[PDB]
C-alpha cells in the first residue's frame, strides 16, 4: 500500500518536473526535448509497478491527500482514483506518448519553438492524467477543460495561418457545447445527491438518472466527436502531425468515452440512456467511415477513421459493455498513433505533401514505413490476433448477440466493412502503383528517432492486445455461444470490404472518363454538414449580435 | 517516363503488399511448431 501509493503519485509528479524546471533551475535548453522524452520514459516504468500490483491482487486505492475547500456540507479534496481504468490506461498513454515524443524530436527538429512544443505536449499529457485519475467531478472538470485548452494551443500551433486559428477556435466551440452537459451533470449530482465524489454517487445509485446521464452523454458527444458535434475532429488536422497522433490516440478524443465508462455503475441501470448512446454511436461510426471513403488528405482519412472508431466505442457503451469499450481505447491507441506517425513519415519525405493522389510507389522506397503502415492497417481492420482483434472482434460478437436496436446493429456492421475500404484506399494510393510525386527524390527514413519510435508502437500493435487481454481480471460474463454466422460476421464483412475496395481501386486505372454521382459528392464534402452549418450558424449569430 | 522505369518499374500488388514477410514468418512458424510438437513426445 505504501509502495503502491507512493509510486502512483510519483508518476504524476515526475511529469510536472520538466514544467517546474522551466523556471531556470538547471534547465538545459541544449536538449529540453530529450529531457522531456526521458521523463515520459521514466514515468512509464514507475507506472508499471502499481499496474503489476493491480494485475496480481487487484489492489485498488483512493488517495485524497489534500483538503482544498469545504463548502458547508461539500468537502473538495485533491483525490486520485488508482483503479482498474487508471492502472491500465496510464501505462498505455505513457508508452504511446513516449513514442510520439521521440518521433517529434525528428519531425519538429527544424521548428524554432521546439522547446515550447514539447512543453505543450507535456502539459497535454498532464491534464489528461488529471482527467483519468480524477475521483471527483470538479477535479475531472479541471482535466476535462485542460485538454480542451491544450488542443486549442496545439491545433493553432502555426498561428500565422488563418485556417489553423479557425480550426483551433472550432475545437473550442464544439467542446464547450459538450461542456454544457458536463455542468448539467455537476449541477444535478450536487442538488439531488450531495456530492461530486464518484464514491457517493455510486453508493446512492439514483434511479431517476435520465437528466445527469443525458448531460454526461452530451459532454461525451463533443469531446469524442460524435455525430452532431463531430466536424471539429477532422479540422484538428491543422495542427502538426505529432499533435494529431497524441490528440487521436491517448488524449482528448477518448476522454468523452472514458467519462461514460467511469459512470457505468449508473448507465448499467438506465436502458433509456443505453438506447441513446447506442444510436448515437451507430450513426457516428457509419457516417464518418463513409466520409473517409473519398477523402484525399492522408491526415483527414485517419481523422475520420478515429471518429468511426470512437463511434464503435460509443456503441459498446450503449450495449452495456463498458469494459470492452475501455479495452478498445487501450488497443486503438497503439495502432492509431502508429498510423499517424507513418503518415508523418510519408509527409516529411515528400516535402509536406499530404494528398494521396500525389503519393504512390512508396512500397519499396520506404520499407520500414510500409511495414508499419500495413501492420497498422491490419490491426485497425481487425486482423485476427493483432492488437485490434482483441477488442473489436469481441465488441462485434457482443453486439451481434445483444438485445439491441436492429438498425444500430446493421449500421455498425456496414461501418466495419467501410473500415476495410478506406484502409485499402490509403495502402493502394500511398504505397502501390507508380510514383506520382515530384522529380527531386528526397525520400529518407533512416533516422534512429523515426525508426525507434515507430518500432515500439509496431510491437505494441502486434502484442499489446494479447498481453493486456490476458492480464486484466474478468468483470463480466463474455458471450461465447452463438451461431457460426454471428461468430464470424466481423471477419466476413471485413474480408468483403477488402474484396470490394480492391475492385474499385483497380477501376481507377481504366482509361474511362469518370463523372461524379450525388453520393460521391456527399461523401467528399462530409455530408455537407460543415458547409451548411459553419456558414449558417456563424451568420445567424453574428448578424443578430451587431444589431 | 521516369515513373515507369528502373526501380519504379515493378511494384507489388495489394495482395503482394499484404503478404510481405510471410515467407520468413511462415518458415519460422513451421520451425516453432516443429520444436513444440517434438517436446510433446518428450
Amino acid at each position: 500500500m505504501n509502495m503502491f501509493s507512493s509510486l502512483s503519485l510519483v508518476t504524476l509528479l515526475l511529469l510536472t518536473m520538466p514544467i517546474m524546471m522551466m523556471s531556470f533551475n538547471t534547465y538545459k535548453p541544449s536538449n529540453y526535448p530529450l529531457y522531456v522524452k526521458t521523463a515520459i520514459s521514466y514515468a512509464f516504468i514507475t507506472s508499471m509497478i502499481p499496474t503489476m500490483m493491480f494485475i496480481h491482487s487487484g489492489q485498488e486505492l483512493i488517495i485524497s491527500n489534500w483538503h482544498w475547500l469545504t463548502i458547508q456540507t461539500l468537502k473538495l479534496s485533491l483525490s486520485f482514483k488508482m483503479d482498474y481504468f487508471s492502472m491500465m490506461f496510464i501505462p498505455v498513454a505513457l508508452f504511446v506518448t513516449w513514442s510520439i515524443m521521440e518521433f517529434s524530436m525528428w519531425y519538429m527538429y527544424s521548428d524554432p519553438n521546439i522547446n515550447k512544443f514539447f512543453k505543450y505536449l507535456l502539459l497535454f499529457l498532464i491534464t489528461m492524467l488529471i482527467l483519468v485519475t480524477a475521483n471527483n467531478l470538479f477535479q475531472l472538470f479541471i482535466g476535462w477543460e485542460g485538454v480542451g485548452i491544450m488542443s486549442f494551443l496545439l491545433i493553432g500551433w502555426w498561428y500565422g495561418r488563418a485556417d489553423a486559428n479557425t480550426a483551433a477556435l472550432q475545437a473550442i466551440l464544439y467542446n464547450r457545447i459538450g461542456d454544457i452537459g458536463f455542468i448539467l451533470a455537476m449541477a444535478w449530482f450536487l442538488t439531488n445527491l450531495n456530492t461530486w465524489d464518484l464514491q457517493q454517487i455510486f453508493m446512492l445509485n439514483p434511479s431517476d438518472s435520465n437528466m445527469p446521464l443525458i448531460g454526461l452523454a452530451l459532454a461525451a458527444t463533443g469531446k469524442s466527436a460524435q455525430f452532431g458535434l463531430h466536424p471539429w475532429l477532422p479540422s484538428a488536422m491543422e495542427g502538426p502531425t505529432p499533435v494529431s497522433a497524441l490528440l487521436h490516440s491517448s488524449t482528448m478524443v477518448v476522454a468523452g468515452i472514458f467519462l461514460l465508462i467511469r459512470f457505468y455503475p449508473l448507465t448499467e441501470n438506465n436502458k433509456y440512456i443505453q438506447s441513446i448512446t447506442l444510436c448515437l454511436g451507430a450513426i457516428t461510426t457509419l457516417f464518418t467511415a463513409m466520409c473517409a471513403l473519398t477523402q484525399n488528405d492522408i491526415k483527414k482519412i485517419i481523422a475520420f477513421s478515429t471518429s468511426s472508431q470512437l463511434g464503435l466505442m460509443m456503441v459498446t457503451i450503449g450495449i452495456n459493455q463498458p469494459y470492452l469499450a475501455f479495452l478498445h481505447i487501450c488497443t486503438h491507441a497503439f495502432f492509431k498513433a502508429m498510423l499517424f506517425m507513418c503518415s508523418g513519415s510519408i509527409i516529411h519525405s515528400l516535402n509536406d505533401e499530404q494528398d494521396i493522389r500525389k503519393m504512390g510507389g512508396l512500397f519499396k522506397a520506404m520499407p520500414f514505413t510500409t511495414t508499419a503502415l500495413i501492420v497498422g492497417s491490419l490491426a485497425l481492420t481487425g486482423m485476427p490476433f493483432l492488437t485490434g482483434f482483441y477488442s473489436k472482434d469481441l465488441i462485434i460478437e457482443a453486439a451481434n448477440t445483444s438485445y439491441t436496436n436492429a438498425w444500430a446493429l446493421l449500421m455498425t456492421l456496414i461501418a466495419t466493412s467501410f473500415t476495410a475500404i478506406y484502409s485499402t484506399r490509403i495502402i493502394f494510393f500511398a504505397l502501390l502503383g507508380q510514383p506520382r510525386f515530384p522529380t527531386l527524390v528526397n525520400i529518407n527514413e533512416n533516422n534512429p528517432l523515426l525508426i525507434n519510435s515507430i518500432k515500439r508502437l509496431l510491437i505494441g500493435s502486434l502484442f499489446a492486445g494479447y498481453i493486456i487481454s490476458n492480464n486484466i481480471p474478468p468483470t463480466t460474463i463474455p458471450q461465447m455461444t452463438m451461431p457460426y454466422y454471428l461468430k464470424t460476421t466481423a471477419l466476413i464483412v471485413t474480408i468483403l470490404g477488402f474484396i470490394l475496395a480492391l475492385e474499385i481501386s483497380n477501376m481507377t486505372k481504366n482509361l474511362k472518363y469518370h463523372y461524379p454521382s450525388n453520393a460521391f459528392k456527399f461523401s467528399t464534402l462530409l455530408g455537407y454538414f460543415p458547409t451548411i452549418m459553419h456558414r449558417l450558424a456563424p451568420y445567424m449569430n453574428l448578424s443578430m449580435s451587431q444589431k | 517516363a521516369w515513373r515507369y522505369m528502373g526501380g519504379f518499374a515493378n511494384n507489388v500488388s495489394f495482395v503482394g503488399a499484404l503478404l510481405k514477410g510471410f515467407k520468413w514468418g511462415f518458415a519460422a512458424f513451421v520451425v516453432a511448431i516443429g520444436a513444440e510438437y517434438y517436446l510433446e513426445s518428450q
Binding site: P367, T439, V441, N442, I443, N444, N446 | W2, G6, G7
Partner: peptide, 14 residues
C-alpha cells in the same frame, strides 16, 4: 547527410 537525394531515380536505401 548519409543519403544524397536522387533525380528521377529510385532512392538510396540502407
Amino acid at each position: 547527410a548519409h543519403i544524397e537525394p536522387r533525380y528521377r531515380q529510385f532512392p538510396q536505401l540502407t
